[PDB]
A paper describes a structure:
To further investigate the role of [name] in Thoeris-mediated phage defense, we determined the crystal structure of [name] [name]. The asymmetric unit contains four [name] protomers (chains A–D), the structures of which are essentially identical. The protomers form two dimeric assemblies (AB and CD), which are very similar to each other. Consistent with this prediction, SEC with multi-angle light scattering (MALS) analysis confirmed that the tetrameric state of [name] is predominant in a solution containing a trace amount of octamer. The protomer structure of [name] revealed a two-domain architecture that consists of an N-terminal sirtuin-like domain (residues 1–283) and a C-terminal SLOG-like domain (residues 284–476). The N-terminal domain contains the Rossmann-like fold, in which an extended seven-stranded parallel β-sheet (β3–β4–β2–β1–β5–β6–β7) is sandwiched between two helical layers (α1, α5, α6, and α11 on one side and α7–α10 on the other), comprising a three-layered globular structure. The acetyl substrate-binding pocket of sirtuins is not available in the N-terminal domain of [name] due to the blocking by its α7 helix, excluding the possibility that [name] serves as an NAD+-dependent deacetylase like sirtuins. A structural analysis indicated that this domain could be classified into the Sir2/TIR-associating SLOG (STALD) family within the SLOG superfamily. In our crystal structure of [name], this residue is found within the putative NAD+ binding site in its N-terminal domain. Using liquid chromatography–mass spectrometry (LC-MS), we identified nicotinamide (Nam) and adenosine-5ʹ-diphosphoribose (ADPR) as products of NAD+ degradation by [name], implying that [name] cleaves NAD+ into Nam and ADPR by hydrolyzing the Nam–ribosyl bond of NAD+.
The Thoeris system is composed of two genes, [name] and thsB. In the present study, we report structural and functional analyses of the [name] and ThsB proteins from the [name] Thoeris defense system. Crystal structures of [name] and ThsB were determined to resolutions of 2.5 and 1.8 Å, respectively. Combined with previous findings, these results advance our understanding of the molecular mechanism underlying the Thoeris defense system and suggest that NAD+ degradation is a previously unknown strategy for bacterial antiphage resistance.
Author numbering:
A (entry chain A): 2 to 44, 46 to 55, 59 to 294, 296 to 342, 346 to 391, 394 to 421, 423 to 443, 445 to 454, ...
B (entry chain B): 2 to 38, 84 to 160, 173 to 343, 346 to 418, 423 to 442, 446 to 454, 458 to 476
C (entry chain C): 2 to 52, 59 to 342, 346 to 442, 446 to 454, 459 to 475
D (entry chain D): 2 to 39, 82 to 158, 173 to 291, 296 to 340, 347 to 392, 394 to 443, 446 to 453, 458 to 475
Write the structure that this text describes.
């Protein structure tokens, strides 16, 4: 859909994110709904003191006065303005749902860690030198806040001068960052060419023209012409952005230039898709099938196997007529020792106490997935349709998962008819895709499996 | 058991290993069976138990100045993928599905010919800031450790992360002067001082074998915190069905309460209540999979064909197996469950701690008679107390397993 | 419900909390589900290697190398973190208008509970943080002994007070001032607490009279199954000495049968508060069978003698009811409107307005803990029809566990709700007052009925 | 405007006042119109009177007063402002908390009608100096008690303490006196500043005592100009105007303003919509819909004054209603009158205005009686697009603040 450069980045970074060794380096722009910070305009506060930008040297020497109360007060004012100007965004949420375990930032706000906790992840937040010595138990991500934290205004780093005065507190973070930039693939975001600290930091952690360096990525927005402005001003900003991109290129950081900041979100969304569509939920139970039971068992079997063969992950509720053969199909390929990311089994607890929490149990096992495949769905009560499978359908759809009901294996059929009719509400688009979906509701086992697999692959755009 | 310093190290490094943030830097000593010391080097070394224990630990970072390929070899023998780095360019790539990174700075015995080693210095500095290191295989005669450390560590930060180095105390040689010995001691002391200046604590052992023991202990600390719950039941000994259900339920619930992990085969009559007990504590205030791993058995000929490998696979995850009940239904009647006995056997062939709560009774007698073969030490009262009330039995089991997990 | 001493405490502390100047001091026990901490077992993770010998540990911890301190702190705090959880106590406390929390805990349970209740917490565990004032804060949380995410700076032993007064004295000063000015509830402290007596010895004076009264809730020591009686009477003696020491600082100790009673007590307090802000639901074009002026005057004096008895009113300003609620309020207040006495939330009309009516109503009712229902009729297509809005407000009211009081005598939809309550009455009011409820289906008498009913609720 | 130090103080103390964490410590100077003081206490009491400072302070949301004065000027000013004062002069009174109090007044040296017993007060003051930002005022270098008290309630070894402030007047030369005597007095003032500085109390030296009043006025302005009263009932199409009201409200709320509304027909619902779009509700939106009927209209006037009292700036929109079958709404004009009698900034948007226009023209003429000062004149006249008009309004009121 998007331009070839953006697509290439999406695929490469998807690869790096999925291997769970990618890092995010977040600027102040990420903490703004508009996607950027007008650094000059943010600092109207000196107009509120009558010190128009001569007075700046007096301000600098007031700030750098031996009495740290000065530093604390000014930090408090600026920080407060920042806090009064920031908000949580979908970017933070998407990033929080991604398997990213390393965040670097120069932001004071707690948006990243907040997004992490809202996703029930444990964040190891480090903004002091001593905190680098500790390791939080059961942490899912580390968040390095170099320039300090909003709840500690006097210790906050606002200007590069601190690096010069207090290297003992800044150098360990610089060391850590250098190492990470050697070892992890970074995405720089929220930085513009007017950012006051990025070039310094990069100059402290990266070598110029140094060959064979790890390639990192940075997303920015294209500079566009303003209505009431001379063309020299526009070409000025264009030139500045060009120099910024060149400097970033010197450190093997490839810059991707978007038309607008919203594209960032889109990109992130796409990346998440690429991830979530690789863990599949297999819904279904059966006592009855119009194939021979053993043959159907083999259908489920090799469906699972050629799910696993194509690097997919399976989460199963262990349906009576389906689960055992899913397991068999998985084990055929794995025992040639079970990786935990390939097959996750969640058999349902029987009894009153289990059924009391079966719903939360289902939501819990389906949350792990981004695509739900539906097979059969019958049980013994009297042969009766299994309501549980349709419930799993509902939960899947309220969770924005791609729904793939195999109508050949007729409750599955019922949902395939509920979706095939009124089809725009489930798959807004038409592409092979419409034909493939229709091809699921009496071919061979290989053919049907190929249909399902290729449909699910088409889903991961 | 050991002296307080080693125990403290064991605790800190256990935490770091379990948190998958530990690193190892291996000197030439680790590649020697005796624990101490070009073309000849490769011709004089091969694999040791330390390498195997390390390979079994969830350690993802190895730094070394050795040319031998013992680390990567040990890792592969444990069926794990090693990302081996000896060139600058290789740092830009990340090997897919890797379990550990192995930085071999001074090059590798393969690729003999292999300044511009700056990226490795960056990586090591960062790692020393963020990861807890164990230095091992280094003596005071090592030509490179002090240089590398002088390039990757600052002596002006006191609040930095603590690292460790294990060495052996210098001992007097048969028939040698005392001045020469005191010379060697003085030099080892200076070595310790030099390491201390970079906040690397040196622990001095009586012998190199103690290294192994320490490692063993560490492994224990990990493996004993994931429990395998074996058992199935239609009848429940001398309790009411519902009552047994409350027993299994809350046993599971305070297995989870004391930070234990559960692996279950979801046996009929046990599994659902293990699950319930877990969910009660876990749904308080999603299921982390490092907390509960369910491995229900596939039914049918094709499943039973690999039930054995399936069982060994699920038990491999654990270091302690608790055994409950073990009865089934074969033809209308209650019959002992062979599966629990199989899981017991597999547990013991895997050198796992076996805890049968008196088929359970049968295994408790198998353990109580040959008790020197299962638990060399004395515990003895609790084990006998496993064969009371529900709270009492649960506390017995849990505190016993706790004693195992020192 | 409970013994006169506990009830008395409930009234006094309810009074102190309601003026929004009460403070809580929380010990480690509050961060436990069982309500207490066995300090020895806490010491064990350091005692597990080699357990006279304690001076070696003391000198290791107090060694020039701060790595020692960091390590020991890390181990002990980690044990804490693996042993703590959030409790109903935290949630109840977080819903209460308490703006001052003191604690020696490292955990972030208090701040967590506050934030889950959408309150902004100014958390201070460093000296410098005392110099700051967090914008839009609802409560201050002083963590005197540090924070769990800053293990190396954590205060474990009293020794720090002796070594670093520059870091501890400001907190001591603040605590002293607060204990002079705010009424405190001590909870989570037992006689085995390693620091409380020291801290009290530095922030309170003994035998000096006219001190502010504070409160401490503990559980009586009980005998353990199969153990000698001397150990029990030992623990009893220790608890008695502890109570005596707290009494010495004008801190009254209340001794409960079990820790759950803490929760119960807290619950009661919350009740006493939440039932004092009333939501008045109702709109009317017709007023059952009374003359308009008479019914309007009923609403009027209902509001006026709700306020006369120190109640608070939140109104959606329904047509036929709202204006007269306002009138009734103004008669009593204009004798200058305090904000928490009357909160008016008139509904925005139009499609864009109706788009958020549900959230608007939930927002209204959340401020309140008891909802009174009057009438509920409007014109729908030319004729008088029942107002579904009142029914919705009822649903939302009960889903938020607010006490629902439908006046069926002056009512249409109100009457409907009176039947909804009289039927399945065990689902709304577990207890026996039944007559007062029945009297809801004169003006002075009806108002007295309503008011004494809601008063009985508190 | 004023010097950067004073401005910084104004912003910091404004924040502390707004967060209801500011405290005042009053010396004898505050009880004197001349701003300073040159058996004795009887004469002193017979020599004091109420000042604008006391009123400004009483109008501010300040809940903590410490004083060494014997006079009752603080509590008097508070009670004249219809506030409840918890007055403390004994130790036992510290154990009690007066209900519905708005401010506490520590009279640690007693009261004129109230002719060890220090320790609880010392504790309270120490704590307050740790947690609350103080303004010391009415103290000169000849004051006999300030240094003692400070030495008893503050540590000189704590450097990272909360910063407090003390306002004094610069020593000036007296008509015909030697330069050595003047330099003597200057030296003493400088040493005084040093002594306060040792306790981390920053001293701001003003040109004259009235500047104290000016500073306080500025602070009060900063407070009252942050709550806006939206006046109006109801050129453009109805939906467009409704969205105009909507987004005006919406980024009035977005720019940290507070709205008080009488919920006028044609305006109220859209003010509400605009507020909730930005948004559960805090002190950001106070709705005071008018009660209909004879009894309500009997109290509509007091109702309006109470409304507008919460605010310091009133914006006027439209103002039309249906009577006996479109007619000007006298109520909006009444709200204008009350607004001006309450010293509120009047911002009538005469653009899409009816009565708003009448008042905007009433303002354009005799413009000096509403805004004593000039450009601002262009912005007032500008009262275009919707974004442009709302931005005009917002920038006008922002210039006001």
């Amino acid at each position: 859909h998007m331009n070839p450069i953006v697509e290439l980045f999406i695929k490469d970074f998807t690869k790096e994110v999925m291997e769970e060794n990618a890092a995010i380096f977040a600027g102040a722009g990420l903490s703004m709904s508009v996607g950027y910070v007008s650094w000059a305009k943010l600092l109207p506060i000196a107009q509120e003191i009558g010190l128009d930008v001569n007075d700046l040297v007096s301000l600098a020497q007031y700030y750098c006065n031996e009495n740290q109360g000065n530093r604390g007060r000014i930090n408090q004012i600026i920080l407060d303005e920042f806090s009064r100007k920031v908000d949580l965004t979908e970017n933070h949420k998407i990033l929080a749902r991604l398997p990213i375990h390393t965040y670097w930032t120069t932001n004071y706000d707690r948006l990243i860690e907040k997004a992490l906790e809202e996703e029930n992840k444990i964040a190891d937040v480090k903004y002091t030198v001593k905190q680098l010595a500790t390791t939080k138990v059961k942490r899912d991500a580390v968040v390095y806040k170099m320039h300090g934290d909003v709840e500690h205004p006097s210790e906050a780093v606002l200007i590069k001068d601190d690096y010069e005065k207090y290297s003992i507190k800044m150098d360990p973070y610089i060391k850590a960052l250098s190492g990470d930039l050697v070892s992890k693939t970074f995405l720089f975001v929220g930085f513009s060419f007017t950012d006051p600290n990025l070039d310094y930091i990069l100059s402290r952690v990266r070598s110029a023209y140094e060959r064979d360096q790890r390639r990192h990525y940075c997303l920015i927005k294209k500079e566009e012409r303003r209505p009431d402005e001379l063309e020299a001003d526009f070409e000025y900003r264009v030139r500045k952005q060009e120099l910024f991109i060149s400097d970033l290129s010197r450190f093997n950081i490839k810059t991707i230039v978007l038309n607008n900041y919203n594209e960032i979100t889109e990109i992130l969304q796409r990346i998440e898709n690429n991830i979530k569509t690789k863990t599949v939920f297999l819904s279904g139970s059966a006592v009855e099938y119009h194939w021979e039971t053993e043959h159907a068992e083999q259908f489920i079997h090799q469906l699972s196997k050629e799910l696993i063969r194509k690097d997919f992950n399976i989460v199963s509720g262990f349906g009576l007529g389906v689960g055992s053969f899913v397991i068999n199909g998985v084990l055929e390929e794995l025992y040639m020792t079970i990786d935990d990311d390939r097959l996750i089994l969640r058999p349902f607890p029987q009894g009153k106490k289990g059924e009391e929490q079966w719903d939360k149990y289902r939501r819990d096992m389906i949350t792990r997935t981004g695509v739900s495949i539906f097979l059969y769905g019958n049980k013994i009560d009297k042969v009766v349709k299994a309501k549980g499978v349709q419930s799993e359908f509902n939960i899947s759809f309220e969770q924005n998962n791609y729904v793939v009901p195999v109508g050949a294996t007729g409750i599955a059929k019922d949902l395939w008819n509920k979706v095939n009719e009124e089809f725009e509400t489930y798959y807004p688009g038409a592409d092979r895709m419409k034909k493939l979906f229709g091809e699921l509701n009496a071919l061979s086992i290989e053919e049907l499996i190929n249909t399902i697999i290729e449909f699910v692959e088409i889903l991961s755009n």
